[PDB]
Amino acid sequence: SKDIYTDAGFITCWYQTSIVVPAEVQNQSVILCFVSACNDFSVRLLRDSPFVRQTAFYQ
Amino acid sequence: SKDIYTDAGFITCWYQTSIVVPAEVQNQSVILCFVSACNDFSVRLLRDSPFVRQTAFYQ
Amino acid sequence: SDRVRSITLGNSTITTQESANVVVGYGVWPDYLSDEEATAEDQPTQPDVATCRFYTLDSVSWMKESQGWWWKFPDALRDMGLFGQNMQYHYLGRSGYTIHVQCNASKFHQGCLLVVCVPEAEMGAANINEKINREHLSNGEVANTFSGTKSSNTNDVQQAVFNAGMGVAVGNLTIFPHQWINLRTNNCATIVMPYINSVPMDNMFRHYNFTLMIIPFAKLDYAAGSSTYIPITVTVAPMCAEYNGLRLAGHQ
Amino acid sequence: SDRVRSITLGNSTITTQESANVVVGYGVWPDYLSDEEATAEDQPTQPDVATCRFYTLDSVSWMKESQGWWWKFPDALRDMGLFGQNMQYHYLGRSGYTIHVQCNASKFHQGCLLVVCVPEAEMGAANINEKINREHLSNGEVANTFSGTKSSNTNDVQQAVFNAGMGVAVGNLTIFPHQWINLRTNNCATIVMPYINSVPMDNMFRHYNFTLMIIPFAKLDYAAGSSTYIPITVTVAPMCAEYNGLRLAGHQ
Amino acid sequence: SDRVRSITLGNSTITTQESANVVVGYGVWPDYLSDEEATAEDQPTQPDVATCRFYTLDSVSWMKESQGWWWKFPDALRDMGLFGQNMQYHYLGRSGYTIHVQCNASKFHQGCLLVVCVPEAEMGAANINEKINREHLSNGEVANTFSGTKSSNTNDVQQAVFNAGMGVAVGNLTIFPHQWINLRTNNCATIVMPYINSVPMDNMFRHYNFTLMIIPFAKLDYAAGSSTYIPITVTVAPMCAEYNGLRLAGHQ
């Protein structure tokens, strides 16, 4: 969760050089992004997820 | 030669996926086909070819 | 290079020239059922040439506005030769698979497919307390189609690409054995899939083992002179198929 | 193949896929100053992670009518982090460099750059008996530009491409450590440059060690539908940087 | 890769970058005549540098409607330096050859050439009981041209591509040492051709040893902006040429 003490940083992405494309080829393209953990990764304290929201039962 | 007893089958060719081509490139193209025998191939009985047709001599 | 791959299963051969690699399941290659995991007592049927071979499904056309496709797979091979006949005459079936998907373009086309092989893809309904007809979950070799928005048809699956018909995030759908068909490097995507079920053998009509899904993240796009019709062709081959409990033909 | 190259200096990594090779100076790789060639008597400062890393300069746009660019290089890194701060607090500096220049295109674009690394590029003036201001020889990370004809500005370098600002033939300018960026084979140009000076250490403001020059021989050209904006991006990393004579901040 | 090939014969060198392989005759590499197969009694002439080298013939232009070309080859090198002079002063000649054909395009052009090297290509006539003039079977380095239909000129070869001027099926014409120039993979076609004749040496004017044929099966085709002029350039080098029976210059 968010707190001021343990802030981690900023991921940013910039144009080094432009996208040079030849004739009769589309100019606008798409980047896809992925995330995963490395081999030194850990988690410690169990809690309930902030996403589960029910009001009544599931009859 | 052709007979009903020794019939061999049908060679056929189908579109799996289409021909995707970029811009400024011609769409219609040409397939060439080849035939030969393998290393287990044989022929047995001599006869005259059905193609030779002469009427008189070659003076 | 390692981009050329050749596969021979029976009397059918696939030679590709811009392949990437082969994902093999969860590391397990398809094999027969041993005597320690066996449950039934009678002799199985192992055809192994008349069954284990590539069957070619229908080609589907990929426009700029296409959203996705799915096939259920012990059921899309219902009417494909002796695999389908041996499905109709036996009670218990058990097989692995090999899913090869063809899609070609040029160096001027762009786009990106995601070929996922999802076990137990129990799908939702369009209306919440409504029953789904069997003609909409599966249709044989004819593909069903996702929609871009909230579909609300009668007796139909909820067809929205951002939930994959199952109620999850479609970006998180890469936990399953998957490849990508990227049109600047790839041409094809081979997925070897072993048998994954809670029981050693199961009936091949009442159960759906898994679901192939092809979803384009990067949309297809091209210039004003390139070729418009781009097909997508799926070819499947059962592996290590064996059968148990012979009786008359039917399913009821 | 050997066209893929990866470079790690500190916490910055460059991966290229259409590189050519790496020119290393005059055969010498950058190393620290030994005790036999040393002149000053006090302990130097070797940061080695906070200093030796890639700094990215400004991208410049390459039209069909562009003529060239230059950067002075102990001076273009004046305001780039702890390299610039350690330049401002010390009196004697000594470093090698690694110059990597990015420029990309497609297989439908043509053109050819020449990336030269010229030691002691003492440049001429536009007016012969006139003094050059410091804002025209160097401007930091913002590039100066050559001109196609005889430029006659006030207090400015003589900007003509066929003399490179130095009074020589520009075709003979390949005696220096150089590469080409040919748009049908290349994508980038890596130049490792050791320390070349007449003294073992020197001040990094009063002196200009060398001058990078990028001059297009074959002009950029493309068809009526290809992409127009083509940037050129220069990235530099000091190597074996050490510092001597600590005093207060300033340069006067 | 093995696509780069380099050939040095004398003071002439060919470097190609998209070659395929080299067909060497019927397996035999050209060598000199031994003393067991020799018939004449006097010393032969072996120049070996002034003779064995590449000679470049005329370039021919390949439109969309071009049909084919042929060259007779002890006769197309009549006026090519010391090979032609040593042909004119001697009575008996004996040589092998190396036929290299250049044709280049881009990745947007399509087409396919067939480069055949046909021994004893005795050609037919346009009119059946008529004599062919020598200016139509051969013309030196200037190529003759096939026609698409039944040609009926005076004193001319029957020029129809589907009979190759010889009365056979042109698809069956691949029994001879041949290569293809496919414009998506190839750039050139090298054919090493040894000496094939019924006698150990023969006169090089009265006899035609073989006939090069270049016939486009897949027609040349391109879009509305690509380059129209596409040449085809043939280069030949005699190998192991030796000569016998010196007398005065002439041929009558």
PDB file of C-alpha atoms in Angstrom, chain C residues 153-252:
ATOM      1  CA  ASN C 153     -27.639 -11.952 -27.120  1.00  0.00           C
ATOM      2  CA  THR C 154     -30.039 -14.736 -26.183  1.00  0.00           C
ATOM      3  CA  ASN C 155     -28.500 -18.013 -24.927  1.00  0.00           C
ATOM      4  CA  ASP C 156     -25.003 -16.841 -25.832  1.00  0.00           C
ATOM      5  CA  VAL C 157     -21.601 -16.411 -24.203  1.00  0.00           C
ATOM      6  CA  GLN C 158     -20.693 -12.970 -22.882  1.00  0.00           C
ATOM      7  CA  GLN C 159     -18.428 -11.916 -25.758  1.00  0.00           C
ATOM      8  CA  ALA C 160     -16.076  -9.188 -24.564  1.00  0.00           C
ATOM      9  CA  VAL C 161     -12.370  -9.285 -25.351  1.00  0.00           C
ATOM     10  CA  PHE C 162     -11.269  -7.566 -22.135  1.00  0.00           C
ATOM     11  CA  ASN C 163     -12.734 -10.460 -20.126  1.00  0.00           C
ATOM     12  CA  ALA C 164     -12.101 -13.333 -22.622  1.00  0.00           C
ATOM     13  CA  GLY C 165     -15.572 -14.734 -21.924  1.00  0.00           C
ATOM     14  CA  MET C 166     -14.330 -15.993 -18.542  1.00  0.00           C
ATOM     15  CA  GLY C 167     -14.358 -12.932 -16.261  1.00  0.00           C
ATOM     16  CA  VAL C 168     -10.626 -12.284 -15.858  1.00  0.00           C
ATOM     17  CA  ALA C 169      -8.184  -9.696 -17.135  1.00  0.00           C
ATOM     18  CA  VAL C 170      -7.131 -10.579 -20.680  1.00  0.00           C
ATOM     19  CA  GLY C 171      -3.618  -9.265 -20.025  1.00  0.00           C
ATOM     20  CA  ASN C 172      -3.235 -11.814 -17.214  1.00  0.00           C
ATOM     21  CA  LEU C 173      -4.167 -14.615 -19.616  1.00  0.00           C
ATOM     22  CA  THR C 174      -0.508 -15.477 -20.320  1.00  0.00           C
ATOM     23  CA  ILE C 175      -0.194 -17.936 -17.429  1.00  0.00           C
ATOM     24  CA  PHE C 176      -1.338 -20.677 -19.840  1.00  0.00           C
ATOM     25  CA  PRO C 177       0.905 -22.279 -22.520  1.00  0.00           C
ATOM     26  CA  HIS C 178       1.017 -19.557 -25.143  1.00  0.00           C
ATOM     27  CA  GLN C 179       2.886 -18.034 -28.047  1.00  0.00           C
ATOM     28  CA  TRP C 180       2.611 -14.839 -30.070  1.00  0.00           C
ATOM     29  CA  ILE C 181       2.279 -14.436 -33.810  1.00  0.00           C
ATOM     30  CA  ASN C 182       4.170 -11.197 -34.380  1.00  0.00           C
ATOM     31  CA  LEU C 183       4.049 -10.278 -38.042  1.00  0.00           C
ATOM     32  CA  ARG C 184       7.590  -8.870 -38.184  1.00  0.00           C
ATOM     33  CA  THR C 185       9.323 -12.024 -36.898  1.00  0.00           C
ATOM     34  CA  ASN C 186       6.862 -14.924 -36.735  1.00  0.00           C
ATOM     35  CA  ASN C 187       4.897 -16.948 -39.209  1.00  0.00           C
ATOM     36  CA  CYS C 188       3.447 -19.714 -37.023  1.00  0.00           C
ATOM     37  CA  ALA C 189       2.995 -20.896 -33.445  1.00  0.00           C
ATOM     38  CA  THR C 190       3.404 -24.518 -32.316  1.00  0.00           C
ATOM     39  CA  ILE C 191       1.967 -25.592 -28.945  1.00  0.00           C
ATOM     40  CA  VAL C 192       2.400 -29.149 -27.669  1.00  0.00           C
ATOM     41  CA  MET C 193      -0.309 -29.802 -25.079  1.00  0.00           C
ATOM     42  CA  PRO C 194      -0.424 -32.879 -22.795  1.00  0.00           C
ATOM     43  CA  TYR C 195      -3.500 -34.340 -21.116  1.00  0.00           C
ATOM     44  CA  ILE C 196      -4.650 -32.248 -18.147  1.00  0.00           C
ATOM     45  CA  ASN C 197      -7.718 -33.444 -16.239  1.00  0.00           C
ATOM     46  CA  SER C 198      -8.679 -34.541 -12.736  1.00  0.00           C
ATOM     47  CA  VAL C 199      -9.359 -38.155 -13.831  1.00  0.00           C
ATOM     48  CA  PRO C 200      -7.151 -40.493 -15.933  1.00  0.00           C
ATOM     49  CA  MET C 201      -9.664 -40.898 -18.770  1.00  0.00           C
ATOM     50  CA  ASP C 202     -12.831 -38.997 -19.585  1.00  0.00           C
ATOM     51  CA  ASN C 203     -15.624 -38.993 -22.141  1.00  0.00           C
ATOM     52  CA  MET C 204     -14.888 -36.824 -25.144  1.00  0.00           C
ATOM     53  CA  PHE C 205     -18.388 -35.401 -25.705  1.00  0.00           C
ATOM     54  CA  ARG C 206     -19.670 -34.528 -22.239  1.00  0.00           C
ATOM     55  CA  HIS C 207     -16.392 -32.788 -21.301  1.00  0.00           C
ATOM     56  CA  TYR C 208     -14.465 -29.919 -22.902  1.00  0.00           C
ATOM     57  CA  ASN C 209     -10.782 -30.410 -22.067  1.00  0.00           C
ATOM     58  CA  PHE C 210      -9.410 -27.021 -23.140  1.00  0.00           C
ATOM     59  CA  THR C 211     -10.032 -24.001 -25.374  1.00  0.00           C
ATOM     60  CA  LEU C 212      -7.762 -22.432 -27.968  1.00  0.00           C
ATOM     61  CA  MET C 213      -7.958 -18.629 -28.063  1.00  0.00           C
ATOM     62  CA  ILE C 214      -6.469 -16.286 -30.674  1.00  0.00           C
ATOM     63  CA  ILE C 215      -6.759 -12.629 -29.614  1.00  0.00           C
ATOM     64  CA  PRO C 216      -5.077  -9.748 -31.535  1.00  0.00           C
ATOM     65  CA  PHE C 217      -3.576  -7.207 -29.149  1.00  0.00           C
ATOM     66  CA  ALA C 218      -1.903  -5.074 -31.814  1.00  0.00           C
ATOM     67  CA  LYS C 219      -4.536  -4.551 -34.487  1.00  0.00           C
ATOM     68  CA  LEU C 220      -3.924  -5.474 -38.101  1.00  0.00           C
ATOM     69  CA  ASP C 221      -2.938  -2.476 -40.177  1.00  0.00           C
ATOM     70  CA  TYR C 222      -1.570  -1.872 -43.658  1.00  0.00           C
ATOM     71  CA  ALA C 223      -1.236   0.775 -46.341  1.00  0.00           C
ATOM     72  CA  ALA C 224      -3.477   1.696 -49.254  1.00  0.00           C
ATOM     73  CA  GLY C 225      -2.047  -0.869 -51.686  1.00  0.00           C
ATOM     74  CA  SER C 226      -1.199  -3.954 -49.657  1.00  0.00           C
ATOM     75  CA  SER C 227      -3.208  -7.176 -49.624  1.00  0.00           C
ATOM     76  CA  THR C 228      -6.427  -7.047 -47.624  1.00  0.00           C
ATOM     77  CA  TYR C 229      -7.403 -10.704 -47.166  1.00  0.00           C
ATOM     78  CA  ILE C 230      -5.227 -12.278 -44.461  1.00  0.00           C
ATOM     79  CA  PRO C 231      -6.381 -15.742 -43.324  1.00  0.00           C
ATOM     80  CA  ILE C 232      -5.637 -17.538 -40.065  1.00  0.00           C
ATOM     81  CA  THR C 233      -5.441 -21.323 -40.353  1.00  0.00           C
ATOM     82  CA  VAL C 234      -5.361 -23.753 -37.415  1.00  0.00           C
ATOM     83  CA  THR C 235      -4.069 -27.322 -37.706  1.00  0.00           C
ATOM     84  CA  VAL C 236      -4.272 -29.885 -34.882  1.00  0.00           C
ATOM     85  CA  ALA C 237      -2.880 -33.393 -34.375  1.00  0.00           C
ATOM     86  CA  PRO C 238      -3.839 -35.694 -31.487  1.00  0.00           C
ATOM     87  CA  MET C 239      -0.954 -37.377 -29.715  1.00  0.00           C
ATOM     88  CA  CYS C 240      -0.935 -40.660 -27.760  1.00  0.00           C
ATOM     89  CA  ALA C 241      -4.659 -41.158 -28.296  1.00  0.00           C
ATOM     90  CA  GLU C 242      -6.158 -44.265 -26.722  1.00  0.00           C
ATOM     91  CA  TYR C 243      -9.729 -45.378 -26.207  1.00  0.00           C
ATOM     92  CA  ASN C 244     -11.677 -47.553 -23.809  1.00  0.00           C
ATOM     93  CA  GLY C 245     -15.152 -49.042 -23.440  1.00  0.00           C
ATOM     94  CA  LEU C 246     -16.433 -49.951 -26.902  1.00  0.00           C
ATOM     95  CA  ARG C 247     -20.195 -49.761 -27.499  1.00  0.00           C
ATOM     96  CA  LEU C 248     -22.660 -48.592 -30.177  1.00  0.00           C
ATOM     97  CA  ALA C 249     -22.494 -45.245 -31.958  1.00  0.00           C
ATOM     98  CA  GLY C 250     -24.254 -42.212 -30.551  1.00  0.00           C
ATOM     99  CA  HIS C 251     -24.069 -39.541 -27.892  1.00  0.00           C
ATOM    100  CA  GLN C 252     -27.069 -39.296 -25.553  1.00  0.00           C
TER     101      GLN C 252
END
